[PDB]
Amino acid sequence: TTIKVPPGPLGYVYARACPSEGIELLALLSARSGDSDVAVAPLVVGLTVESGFEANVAVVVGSRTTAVSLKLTPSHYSSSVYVFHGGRHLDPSTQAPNLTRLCERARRHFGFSDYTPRPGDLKHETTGEALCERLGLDPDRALLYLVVTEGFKEAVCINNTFLHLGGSDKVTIGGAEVHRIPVYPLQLFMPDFSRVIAEPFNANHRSIGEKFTYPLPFFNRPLNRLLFEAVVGPAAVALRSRNVDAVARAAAHLAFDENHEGAALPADITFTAFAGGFEQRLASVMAGDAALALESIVSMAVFDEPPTDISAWPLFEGQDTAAARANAVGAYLARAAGLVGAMVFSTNSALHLTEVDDAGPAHSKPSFYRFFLVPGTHVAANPQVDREGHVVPGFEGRPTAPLVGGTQEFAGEHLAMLSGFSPALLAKMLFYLERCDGAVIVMDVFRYVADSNQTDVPCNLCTFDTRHACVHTTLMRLRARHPKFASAARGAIGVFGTMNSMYSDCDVLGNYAETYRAATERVMAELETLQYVDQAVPTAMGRLETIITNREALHTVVNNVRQVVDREVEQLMRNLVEFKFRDGLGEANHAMSLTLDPYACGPCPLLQLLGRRSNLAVYQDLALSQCHGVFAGQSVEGRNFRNQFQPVLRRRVMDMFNNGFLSAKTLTVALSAICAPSLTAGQTAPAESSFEGDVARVTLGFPKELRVKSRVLFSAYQKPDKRVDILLGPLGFLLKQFHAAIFPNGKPPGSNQPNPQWFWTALQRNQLPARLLSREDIETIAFIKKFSLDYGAINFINLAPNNVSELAMYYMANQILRYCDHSTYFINTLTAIIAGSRRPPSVQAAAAWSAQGGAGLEAGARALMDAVDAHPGAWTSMFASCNLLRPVMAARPMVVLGLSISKYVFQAGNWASLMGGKNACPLLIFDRTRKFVLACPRAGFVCAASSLCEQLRGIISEGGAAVASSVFVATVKSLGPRTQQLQIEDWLALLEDEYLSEEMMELTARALERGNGEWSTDAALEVAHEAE
Ligand SMILES: [Hg+2]
Ligand SMILES: [Hg+2]
Ligand SMILES: [Hg+2]
Ligand SMILES: [Hg+2]
Ligand SMILES: [Zn+2]
């Protein structure tokens, strides 16, 4: 009907004493640069917040007149907290030195502004030390961090917030005591004020309510600096707005004034140089706002996923006794490294698409592809031009690099930009980059460092003793993967997201629907019964090493899968008839959704940045596709065209909700006795529970997920006419693996080792040594050849099955296609690149972690490897391919893939591909008949892994007057006529209720009278179900 959400502050400042154990773990999940006392850590119940922590909340944003009532706006807590005091207690994500310095100069190189606290405000700063004093904590054995709602983190750093020192309380995290001071909006003291406050320290501002006791803004430098860098920066870069402070204020504007449409980004935002190019520029700011606005919507929304709880992470199970549970976490994050690697080296990654290009119209005709994002990491140095294409001020002189080609440079400065010029985040970036380059086609770190002493190094960030971990070195090691932007045409976006749905359509034939999904499930069930497979690990042999011991076993296994598949297909199709076959499959496509839920992201500020950046790109893309229609037949050069039409661009975007690509939902907020600071007693006095107010806007409408789909059925999909080699055929994997068992005396002349390669080669050319084949081998070879021939005749999946799981699904798919008379072309396939991890495969891979870096570098490395177990963060990414997605998606994984949005006014998220070839990922193969996904499992690590007495005795609980009826049904829908066998004892067990059991006994009896003495229906359900 209507959803509820508790009124609360916009955030809290958590303060606790330095824990002394699970810190090493917290650090791994966190992001922290070794040269700074600040850090950003993930929001994790039991780690950074107490257990009853409630993410969704209606924050007190202001006050109204008519007596003063409060204003509340819903929002949720940001997926990560911000440590502004105590970062020193967290091991740096990297040994990389002077990241703070590197960011500083990189920021100046690309034209972005730096955090600059006003001199006249310092006297009002609230220092960590100061708070530690009030809280009675040791300034050197203490941690202070901000826990905020997504909608006001920006409000905090522009000093539009204040601490309610009187509302202090304590909570427990892991048995430890933790203090927390609630944070509120200064606007509270300004009735009917929805604007951002400039000069928040002016206690005499006219908008302040009279006789009110204006509080002291909560101004902390380390904090404000970290937010600017870790929260405002990424957006600043993403929405190409070099005046960072301005960006922060634009977000605050959207958070304080729900009714705000029109311009938000600075009115004088500049533009990277590379009628006239006037519209191009305009389309970018408008899309820029479009995106900033859309993201705000999602920030003021309320999602269903709860904040992660470390004590729920199956990742610890068993390997969690010793404090060396840290390894589990270390090995986990290492997998992700492989994904972040792709997000940095894919030439079309969201992290790079920061500029917009005008391809011109296709003259009033639609132009949904005129404007689009292009990579601009290599051009962020070009001159900044204004609205009218004129260079601004300090940009005169700068060389303007070309958008395509040219000899590009990808140095530390750039890496820093991708991470919003935040050294804290950049650190976590390197942490992952350091776990990358699972190269097998190619640098000697040790040799490099050695031959570099006092040799004049091109880097003023490191020294001989630190070269092993310095950015420049790491980038040197990954040089081959560096992004070379050479494409000029509009491309797909390389997004990082997490498919958190319990449901997906990535079966070999996608969503072709009993339904097709059901069938594949039963077959997989059946195969598991035969013990030929492990539904969760397709790659598993599951008892096959035992079953297949004689060539007669082969016969039976092949016949069983063939048989169970034919049986289930025979059924599914027959049912579908009792639907249009030919038309139905040419329509079905593979599908998956990417959540926009802030708590479905990984437990790391970096993995979070990636998702946030991705979504921003996706929003701009959408905004962009509507710009041309917005300009059409309008004097587009008007002084403030932006404020005049943004409202429209905005609306055209909102219109996309539930229209093909953007899945959206609506929530109605229930109105109302409210505890909140006193508008008079001061921020020190206790909370005033007198206030009674509601939510300004009762209706919430926001994006929920991204619908990505890829057409299954289809030039290059032409099934070659040539026959397939038996060894590369449907049974190739089995024949090779169990050759010795099937063909015992199958070893060649000379060797005493049964070699399948040799055997089947000679067997197929007649070059097989005269009369070798047993009397019974011929029957098997025959059997083999026929299956291979039959399957081949109907096969349209251009991939060789690698295990029984795939063998059954492909065969089943091929059988369904044969039923529909499919012909000529191969179908489209999906391949997952599973992200895994392992201990460093060499000393080389540990270079950057050696504790000794000078002449003792290579020894330090070796020592590190010698005691690998002691280093919980000493892991490395590796990849594995999988052509069976069902299991993959079951793990509700974090993913990285190419996404191309088409707008025809519907939207469709076309599954595209990552550019940069093997550089984005070495396992990526160019082939237009297949699509890929880099995937890192979640379920089984940071999520629960992939019961009637319960369901029944669950209805007996949350149930009304028809419990009897409801329960009878469930029992029947879980037991056929079996229900009739149940005696009073059986019932009393299924329901620990005597009354109910007797009722069940009366029902069961009546249903028998209906069938005259032959069980069947439950019309008696509805009949009794009358108690209304
Ligand atoms: Hg400590
Ligand atoms: Hg209270
Ligand atoms: Hg798999
Ligand atoms: Hg990969
Ligand atoms: Zn260096």
UniProtKB/Swiss-Prot annotation:
One of its GO terms (cellular component) is nuclear viral factory. GO terms for biological process: bidirectional double-stranded viral DNA replication; DNA replication. The keyword Secreted does not apply. InterPro entries: DBP_sf, Viral_ssDBP_head, Viral_ssDNA-bd. GO terms for molecular function: DNA binding; single-stranded DNA binding; zinc ion binding. The keyword Zinc-finger applies. Keywords: DNA replication, DNA-binding, Host nucleus, Metal-binding, Zinc, Zinc-finger. A motif (Required for filament formation) lies at residues 759-760. It is found in: Host nucleus. A zinc finger (unnamed) spans 459-472. Belongs to the herpesviridae major DNA-binding protein family. Plays several crucial roles in viral infection. Participates in the opening of the viral DNA origin to initiate replication by interacting with the origin-binding protein. May disrupt loops, hairpins and other secondary structures present on ssDNA to reduce and eliminate pausing of viral DNA polymerase at specific sites during elongation. Promotes viral DNA recombination by performing strand-transfer, characterized by the ability to transfer a DNA strand from a linear duplex to a complementary single-stranded DNA circle. Can also catalyze the renaturation of complementary single strands. Homooligomers. Forms double-helical filaments necessary for the formation of replication compartments within the host nucleus. Interacts with the origin-binding protein. Interacts with the helicase primase complex; this interaction stimulates primer synthesis activity of the helicase-primase complex. Interacts with the DNA polymerase. Interacts with the alkaline exonuclease; this interaction increases its nuclease processivity. Interacts with ICP27; this interaction plays a role in the stimulation of late gene transcription. This is Major DNA-binding protein. It comes from Human herpesvirus 1 (strain 17) (HHV-1).
